[PDB]
Amino acid sequence: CPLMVKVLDAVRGSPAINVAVHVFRKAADDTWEPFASGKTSESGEPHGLTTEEEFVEGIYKVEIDTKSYWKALGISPFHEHAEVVFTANDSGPRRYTIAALLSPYSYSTTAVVTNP
Amino acid sequence: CPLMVKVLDAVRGSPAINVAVHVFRKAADDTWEPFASGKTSESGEPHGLTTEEEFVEGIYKVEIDTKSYWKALGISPFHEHAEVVFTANDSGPRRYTIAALLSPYSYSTTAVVTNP
Amino acid sequence: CPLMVKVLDAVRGSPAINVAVHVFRKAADDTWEPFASGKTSESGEPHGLTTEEEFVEGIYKVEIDTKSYWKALGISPFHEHAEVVFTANDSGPRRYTIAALLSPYSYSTTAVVTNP
Amino acid sequence: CPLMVKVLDAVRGSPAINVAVHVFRKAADDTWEPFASGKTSESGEPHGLTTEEEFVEGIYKVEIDTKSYWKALGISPFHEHAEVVFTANDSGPRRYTIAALLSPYSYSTTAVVTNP
């Protein structure tokens, strides 16, 4: 998978399960355009987001529905969601991993690019 | 000041100086309308973004121009910008502080909410 | 105040109030000698930890009692405490601010260093 | 492996390679006692830290030599190292993963406990 997403829960010390993840790509018209989506597994990952042919250079946005996750646990959240926006593949694609760490009033995100 | 923002540089060990901060409010057509903007001082804070009279109920988006910051410094950034999206003042007026910590391939964000 | 500390709660969206902060300095026998201690105020900061006369060159350790904090709140903590170890004043006197963000299973820490 | 460590670099967006990791366990005498150690691979992990028979309930400390890593890249660091101290296995062991994200003047750590 050229693009992987991994979501973790900082309150219970576990992978975040059943979380919706949506990915968008910027078009030449300058608008956001659906590209890929899924729901996190027991590993905290939505499996098989995209393919190598489809993931070209460009500007991408990863949206994680954090509000629905916390509401289900009976814990009051701050954010509507968590978004990560980045430029891809500027010197070709490799393998991209986007990680997100979640708390009710905070989140952190990191990108790991590794040689395939 | 009911909305405050503070930005830090994890590479140089200093406040992130001269960074643009943009604020938008969600409209009834589901578009983002400009609400307020400013630039960080030597302390990493933009002073006087808004007022108590202007800051009503709604869904808000805070956007930090991380890309122009790393470029002026001669460092390659991954993210286009760092975002924060939240519902404000739903159970009455409150004061909000948004903290952001910046690295070339990662960021974190937290919120502190106090009753005025 | 050449050494400052600030602590935040990522679960409640507030400063971490009434948390103990302990400071140690490395001795010539390679043991940690007590140097200073305090408790966080309503702002999440312990005021007046040390002075310019007392804060000489050396290797320092800052320890935050996260375990007693989560327990008073009726939440299960993972970490015993949050630590920060650094060499201070090697190229002359400086001022240091240590920021810490706390969740039950995670923490982050950053340093801001300014010339006095 | 009952205990795994994973180290990431926030400046270059890669796994942190060739980093020394030391693990200690608290003894009844209240002193720190070597338990396991290794060097990070190309994945940012030191492989095969311990075994199931050896990793019993107790208080543990994970030390990551961050200063030697940054010095080798020609980038000036703040911390001497990064330490994580925690109570293990209180209701039996499971599988423990300790993650660490590194910048010159900052680090963050998280623990993920999953059912084996």
Swiss-Prot record, chains A, B, C, D:
Q: Provide the effect of A82S.
A: In AMYLD1; amyloid polyneuropathy
Q: What is the effect of changing V21A?
A: In AMYLD1; amyloid polyneuropathy
What post-translational modification does the entry describe? Not glycosylated under normal conditions. Following unfolding, caused for example by variant AMYLD1 'Gly-38', the cryptic Asn-89 site is exposed and glycosylated by STT3B-containing OST complex, leading to its degradation by the ER-associated degradation (ERAD) pathway.
Instruction: Note the effect listed for D9G.
Output: In AMYLD1; leptomeningeal amyloidosis; leads to unfolding and exposure of N-89 to glycosylation by STT3B and subsequent degradation by the ERAD pathway
Q: Outcome of E45K?
A: In AMYLD1; early-onset amyloid polyneuropathy
Documented effect of changing V21L = In AMYLD1; amyloid polyneuropathy
List of residues binding L-thyroxine: K6, E45, S108
Q: What is the effect of changing I64V?
A: In AMYLD1; amyloid polyneuropathy
Per the UniProt entry, the effect of V19M is:
In AMYLD1; amyloid polyneuropathy
Reported effect of changing K26N?
A: In AMYLD1; amyloid polyneuropathy
Outcome of substituting G38R: In AMYLD1; amyloid polyneuropathy
Per the UniProt entry, the effect of E80K is: In AMYLD1; amyloid polyneuropathy
Record-annotated membrane-spanning stretches: none
Summarizing the annotation, the consequence of altering E80Q is: In AMYLD1; amyloid polyneuropathy and cardiomyopathy
Effect of altering A27P? In AMYLD1; amyloid polyneuropathy
Gene Ontology molecular function terms on file: hormone activity; hormone binding; identical protein binding; molecular sequestering activity; protein-containing complex binding
Q: What is the effect of changing S43P?
A: In AMYLD1; amyloid polyneuropathy
Residue numbers bearing the Sulfocysteine modification:
C1
Q: What else is known?
A: Tetramer dissociation and partial unfolding leads to the formation of aggregates and amyloid fibrils. Small molecules that occupy at least one of the thyroid hormone binding sites stabilize the tetramer, and thereby stabilize the native state and protect against misfolding and the formation of amyloid fibrils. Two binding sites for thyroxine are located in the channel. Less than 1% of plasma prealbumin molecules are normally involved in thyroxine transport. L-thyroxine binds to the transthyretin by an order of magnitude stronger than does the triiodo-L-thyronine. Thyroxine-binding globulin is the major carrier protein for thyroid hormones in man.
> Domain description from the entry?
Each monomer has two 4-stranded beta sheets and the shape of a prolate ellipsoid. Antiparallel beta-sheet interactions link monomers into dimers. A short loop from each monomer forms the main dimer-dimer interaction. These two pairs of loops separate the opposed, convex beta-sheets of the dimers to form an internal channel.
- Name of the protein described by the UniProt record: Transthyretin
Could you say which residues of the full protein are shown? 30 to 145 of 147
